Protein: Flagellin
Organism: Caulobacter vibrioides
Amino acid sequence: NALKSDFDSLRDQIEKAATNAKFNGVSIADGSTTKLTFLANSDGSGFTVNAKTI
Amino acid sequence: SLAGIGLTTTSTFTTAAAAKTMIGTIDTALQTATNKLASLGTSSVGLDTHLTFVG
């Protein structure tokens, strides 16, 4: 039972540490979005980076 | 004026894709305005040359 309770606390810590992974209100690792594109040149062509849910 | 460079008094973007189209719109606007200024400068040089010949 003690091992089970510690396992539950550790998975809750995983979920909350993944919840806190935002940079200035935008996150790539918490599943909030499919992908974030970033500027690559002056014409607006992107630099896509797929989101990786954690 | 903005009507003469392909823009509008209320032109704006409300989303990232609207801004992505706005980039090319501003590109074409700056290109045509710069071409117009170059033509005006050529006309000014022509007026100066005619001034010298008239004198």
About this structure: Residues 16-54 of chain B form the longest helix (39 residues). Chain B touches chain A through four residues (CB under 8 Å).
